[PDB]
A paper describes a structure:
Our study of GsuK started with the structure determination of its two tandem RCK domains, labeled as RCK1 and RCK2. The two intracellular ligand binding RCK domains form a bi-lobed structure equivalent to the MthK RCK dimer; each lobe consists of the N-terminal two-thirds of the RCK domain (βA to αF) and adopts a Rossmann-fold. In GsuK, the equivalent αG helix is absent in RCK1 and becomes a shorter helix with a different orientation in RCK2, resulting in swapped and loosely packed C-terminal subdomains. The pore-connecting top half of the GsuK gating ring is in a contracted form similar to the closed MthK whereas the bottom half is more expanded, suggesting that the structure likely represents a closed conformation. Furthermore, each subunit also contains a small fragment of the pore-lining inner helix at its N-terminus, which forms a short four-helix bundle atop the center of the gating ring and creates a constriction point at the intracellular end of the pore that would occlude the passage of hydrated K+ ions. The helix bundle is tethered to RCK1 by linkers in an extended configuration, ensuring a tight coupling between the gating ring conformational change and pore opening at the intracellular gate. Indeed, electron density modeled as AMP was observed at the predicted nucleotide binding site in the GsuK gating ring structure. As no nucleotides were added during protein purification or crystallization, the bound nucleotide is likely from the E. coli cells used for protein expression. Two bound metal ions were observed in each GsuK subunit. The second bound ion, identified as Ca2+ based on ligand chemistry and functional assays, is positioned at the inter-subunit assembly interface, a location reminiscent of the Ca2+ bowl in BK channel.
Residue numbers in the entry:
A (entry chain B), B (entry chain C), C (entry chain A), D (entry chain D): 110 to 564
The structure:
């Protein structure tokens, strides 16, 4: 066995057997890709994590879920041994230069798809050029999610502007009037005309029922026109005269959150242990937040909210304990670097925990699992239309919309106050006065109305 | 055999059997904790150290007295492996943030008692909030027991005010007209009106006897009123003018020492290589002290006492030789980080040695072997009542001091020149002018002043 | 048993077996020397790499082409066990100081030929003194080869001045009126009278046919008078103004390129993370090129070309992409250290790539297995003569030049548009109007014309 | 089965056989110490090296001549393990503080001898107190022997002034008129009246004879009067007009050389890269000597001598070469850290070479067996007398000189113009007119003439 075997001097694996197919191979093991493995164990997937650190290989070889290979990720010969042409997907999670090198190298050998994690927003373009076909600015995203949760009140965070008509935004419920209520009694479609595409609750995008009661923690995906969204901003109200978010840590994430807050102009103060060599736009206070007066003197006592974004979890927990114990009114949003700390961050007294490991693994998994659906929608228009009077009663197949307009239907919201139906089967009876959501070419969107009217 | 397994490639124990009850597990092994294990080796309990350092685990594997488990100690899955819920207790000797994390984690799984060693006294509150049943500011204690021994004479050093009630104080008998004299020709009981709880020698509190000779090293434990303690302050005599104390090493222990000396107003000078990343109150003279030209320039020639407080014991020894060579009169107090450097620090000519491990291990070891005896000692007051007129010369168990108000006597004093008895068995005959030293509830002692006068 | 000894505890080879002869040993293993061992695998040369690093020995054992010895290069006993006397030749690729030590130690034992790589051009002399037969300033060569490529246009780069008459020049084609033309169409010889000895294409020296298409990657190797080079210079046209070159990386190679560009007065700018521990002659801008505005604010906007000379390949790949992307018109020469990246650098958008490992291992290759011709080409002349009329139609041997003049024909250039013939065989028939290129001594050169006429 | 233990996982020894006697044990291995074991290999003594570093124990194990033991050198229970009380003697070659700590710890267990290498002259006193019997400032000695050899012509150098009658001093023979002519044909013995005690050559010493030839390499050891040294100094002839010595490397040993050359006021320049953590007394030109400019610009053109005193031999060798080449006249003294580099230093061009390994090992060896000859030698005022008339023609077996005065003759200067006898046996015939160097007391020197003649 390899049982008896591995009690002898250790040697790493260098290459994979020739018949290796449909494996996913990971470059840049960390808590986000470790979570991605664990999470995709419902499928008998094969994960190959590649390390060029001989010492790392040794330790990973005792962990299950995945196979470790040792070798230089940027040498064609190593990649060839990994059977990159035969692989299902490739996850590029290295430094940005190392990723470009990785891409270009594999791209010289095959077209196997690559999802790359980009550490600097502006680098995304470059990783595409190098041949990544999917580029996830994880730290930008993780920042945004901190930014969103941090305000006293919670406003609209824009997600999509589809060709200057239909818009998609999210809305945290916390400061809002809608907190502790049902989706029905909140009166959103009734006051605004907006559609509620869904609800985030635990990285789970749930179809929103009428009876569903939303918490302080609920995040509401919404679609509508710019004007409609405005009507909604009016309803939530305006923020406190003097809110001030205080961001502990100005690493790549803290920087992102800061960059988020600056757009909806929200004042913030930043603490870091270090001048941090990428940012030239944010004025930072230097010190160890862990040290006594550091925080008080930096003026944490004027803050309406705190964002705990240290690369160390023990620290994040500690700062949470401290800020809650000292300033028990302030809203605290904390970053969880590993998923095995998320609970302690709550225990310590955080209001929300952005769980990096989950959020990341979650995005990656979806890009893997829903590859085709994502592709099929690239560059397409999403728009909303009142059902044409002469189509009421009809079934979806009966309207013949795709063959006549090119556009098809992806969601219907019922005429009555009734939950949204996403991905309706073609045998769906189109009700009295429902609104429908349609994906189509943007050119065909411009034209849809004209053809429906023509017939 | 694990003698043959010793010789094959190393693999670390990662968890504990299911049948593992009453074990004592330790987080952050160090001189203090290694000493603890050695000390309570007679009390038949298995000790378990936990490290996330692979190599440390290796080197500790071969060590006797305790076994090693290699795992991230802030992880619930690891903790479960360790069978925390089934442990006797936990020693949390990690960093402060790391302690808070380990704390909140073990609380979400179980209720097992946790003694926490605290790096910064201020953080004491937070770690109780984190879930610690007990919290120990060791450095402040070690910083205290240094300064105590630094003064030429040695004065009152307060341990606790029982809130208006009698108070507990320690007295180093070195520069006192009580040095050399046995208990009685000192006359503390007779001519002051105080009680001698115990005498420390080399880190162990003894039965104070009439014949026991006080030396320089002897440290007394005292109980009495505000005016009773101040009655002995003049009995010591005048502590000579021109009193300045040099402390070498302004780390945490060094800093603690300085701040102690500044409470009972006493001047000192601080020397260190590096600027403290923690302290900002004390002005430090900078330079290596091993080079003698630096100490000289600092005015060490106008000093009455030295405190040697360095991370390295080999240096501490060397500095003690350097001084006893120059100033053969000066009071030198040295700190030993290890226990195996104590005798050499004496041999070099130190007047008292504060053994970091000996002191540390005592404080823990006691909290352990008196766990459900000193835990409800949080908020309790200690008091001394006279012997009742009607209940004179009758048995203690019969007096019914538990089923009257709710009181309990931990020690009793004798009227004649007869030796005191600490924690005595419940069958002894009382006497004439005796004084009872009890512990109780902060509202039961108030009742006793009229309860024993009515019942 | 060779594969079982692999699974036991590691012990390195200390010495070669006594009977070892004719082997090539290498001190200072790196990409260049590793490419060397690959390139000369056609020959059954035995390579032994020596290392004083215990760990480096381990990871090189399981590597093919060469065997590893663990010892101190500069211990006379280590060399003795390495059988240095019996060795074919030695490569010195340590630091200058260690090289010097190595050579002196080696000379202490034997006369075995040493080829030494010289980090510092000025230290060339010192290493020859030390015992080294051949001295290679690889950093300077690589520096020069970047500089040649980096100009907007490409100009003559002198290589040899053989006793003040026949000259040898290099000429990169890229900017010139020859790019895209065949050698024939270029009209060089027609208008110049230069001999085209060669074309470098991909590190490979090719024979110039009249119909080989010169591309932008092509490096002509020319032979001729100073006035003839002067003529070619006139034909290339005037260089364009505002030429300014950005050199990213200012370690040895960048520095070398920079110094090269300084001769033909060519403006440049240097960037580096670090201050140079070696170069006091060069004003340097400071920053990580990788970081965004670093380059912009340094004024890479008005650069005409860019040498990307970092010591890390992924970085240089990243930087080439970045520049090709944001400044597409700007010419880019990039340095590859290690051959597994040359392709990617082209893929990224590099105009030219200079392969340290190729160029290096190539030069070292010729210096090895052309030993008894290389350093016997020391004190030697390269000259050109019209084939003496009488020998037209006679064979080379038939002519008997070597016996008569001591001179060896090395190149025959045929009268008409016909191909140059390099290192022609003795059986070659000499043409009618052919020009000869001969190798001999300066004395032999002088005697030649008389020896031919009078004899 | 030692070749079996070798293939399984490594385990160091942590103690020795319960019956290890007469073993000499070394603390802190380094060149000098590793040489000591080689040098005294002829004597069947067990050498035991002790390191607290693990990897050290690993590598020292596969090395012949000495047994390796892993342990904490300062732990008393480790020392009991080493069986110190039974060892022949102890070499403490740790740092100063560690050395102190060691000494005391062993002094807690036994009365076994200790030779201690000091790093700072001023601390040697502290080490004696600590328990070292013999204390040796190598770095001081080594700096001296470097400065002695650096003078253009070579002057006298004072070893000892014993109370002010007999002076012992050294003389390099390099530039003196005595260079080349045998001890006889220079008449030092004859003209100066000085006792030539020793000639030093290639690190060794034996009895000087008239036929033995003094090369530039030679260093004489002389006993005499202040008038006689003053006579030798005349024979030397004046030092050259303008002379300056450059010292490369202001480390411990470099610094000592500089100090030495201030006694005899000789101008000198110091170069180093780093500031001295120790020396305040010396001005230093800061620069890397290796780099070109550094030396020349620091005015090395006008030097008369150079002392090359770097940590790193390869640097010394390289510098020697560089100097010898630039300055063929200027005399060069170079320091060799390991014996395996000595030969290459001469090869490079060094006029003289000081071998730290030799010089150091000689001293320790002569203190380990002439440990028995340090028992009946030192501290006695070394004095010189002719033979008392009443001892002419009689043996030491008949004279009984030592029990009478208390002095023992360490040198019988032969009757005629005949060679000296050092450490003579007690059966040696004494000749009529003869000089004696006695290392007895000046108790028994001012007593000598009285006692030696009255009986
Ligand atoms: N105690 C602390 N106080 C302030 N900043 C910290 C502390 N610990 C870590 N950091 C910062 O947290 C940031 C983490 O960066 P990133 O992981 O990229 O978001 C770094 O800039 C660290 O300097
Ligand atoms: N020779 C020395 N002179 C002055 N300070 C020192 C020396 N050696 C160590 N230290 C410092 O003494 C401090 C000990 O910290 P603590 O144990 O907390 O008092 C550390 O901060 C060390 O940097
Ligand atoms: N991102 C970067 N930006 C600027 N310079 C760099 C970067 N990375 C490495 N270098 C420098 O490139 C140089 C390469 O050295 P050499 O191999 O001697 O040419 C070194 O001096 C490095 O400090
Ligand atoms: N290239 C160099 N140029 C100048 N000084 C050097 C160089 N290399 C080493 N040194 C110095 O040589 C000294 C050797 O120390 P020691 O062995 O104690 O005499 C050190 O203090 C170094 O700073
Ligand atoms: Ca946790
Ligand atoms: Ca000790
Ligand atoms: Ca590559
Ligand atoms: Ca050598
Ligand atoms: Zn920023
Ligand atoms: Zn302080
Ligand atoms: Zn430069
Ligand atoms: Zn100095």
């Amino acid at each position: 066995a390899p049982w008896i075997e591995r009690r002898l001097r250790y040697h790493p694996t260098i290459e994979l057997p020739d018949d290796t197919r449909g494996h996913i191979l990971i470059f840049g093991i960390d808590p986000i890709t470790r979570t991605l493995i664990r999470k995709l164990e419902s499928r008998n997937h094969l994960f190959v994590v590649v390390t060029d650190n001989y010492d790392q290989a040794l330790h990973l070889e005792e962990q299950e879920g995945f196979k470790v290979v040792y070798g230089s990720p940027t040498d064609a010969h190593v990649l060839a041994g990994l059977r990159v042409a035969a692989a299902r997907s490739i996850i590029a999670n290295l430094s940005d230069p190392d990723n470009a090198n990785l891409c270009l190298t594999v791209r010289s050998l095959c077209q196997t798809p690559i999802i790359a994690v980009v550490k600097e927003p502006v680098h995304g373009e470059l990783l595409r050029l190098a041949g990544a076909n999917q580029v996830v600015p994880l730290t930008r995203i993780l920042g945004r999610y901190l930014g969103i949760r941090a305000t006293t009140c919670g406003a609209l965070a824009h997600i999509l502007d589809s060709f200057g008509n239909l818009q998609i935004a999210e809305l945290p419920v916390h400061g809002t009037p809608f907190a502790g209520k049902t989706i029905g009694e909140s009166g959103i479609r009734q006051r605004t005309g907006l559609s509620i595409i869904g609800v985030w609750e635990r990285g789970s995008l749930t179809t929103p029922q009428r009876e569903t009661v939303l918490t302080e923690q609920s995040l509401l995906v919404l679609a509508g026109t710019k004007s409609q969204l405005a009507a909604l901003e009016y309803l939530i109200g305006e923020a406190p005269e003097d809110e001030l978010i205080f961001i502990i840590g100005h690493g790549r994430i803290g920087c992102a959150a800061a960059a988020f807050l600056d757009r909806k102009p929200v004042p913030f103060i930043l603490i870091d242990r270090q001048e941090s060599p990428v940012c030239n736009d944010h004025v930072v206070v230097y010190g160890d937040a862990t040290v006594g007066q550091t925080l008080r003197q930096a003026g944490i006592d004027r803050a309406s909210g705190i964002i705990v974004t240290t690369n160390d979890d023990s620290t994040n927990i500690f700062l949470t304990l401290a800020c809650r114990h000292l300033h028990s009114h302030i809203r605290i949003v904390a970053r969880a670097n590993g998923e095995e700390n998320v609970d302690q961050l709550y225990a310590a007294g955080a209001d929300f925990v952005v769980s990096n490991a989950s959020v990341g693994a979650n995005i990656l998994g979806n890009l893997l699992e829903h590859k085709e659906s994502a592709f099929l929608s690239e560059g397409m228009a999403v728009f909303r239309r009142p059902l044409p009077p002469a189509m009421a009663g009809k079934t979806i197949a009966e309207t013949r919309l795709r063959p006549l307009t090119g556009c098809s239907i992806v969601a219907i919201e019922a005429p009555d106050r009734a939950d949204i139906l996403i991905s309706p089967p073609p045998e769906t009876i189109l009700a009295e006065g429902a609104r429908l959501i349609l994906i189509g070419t943007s050119e065909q969107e411009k034209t849809f109305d004209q053809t429906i009217a023509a017939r």
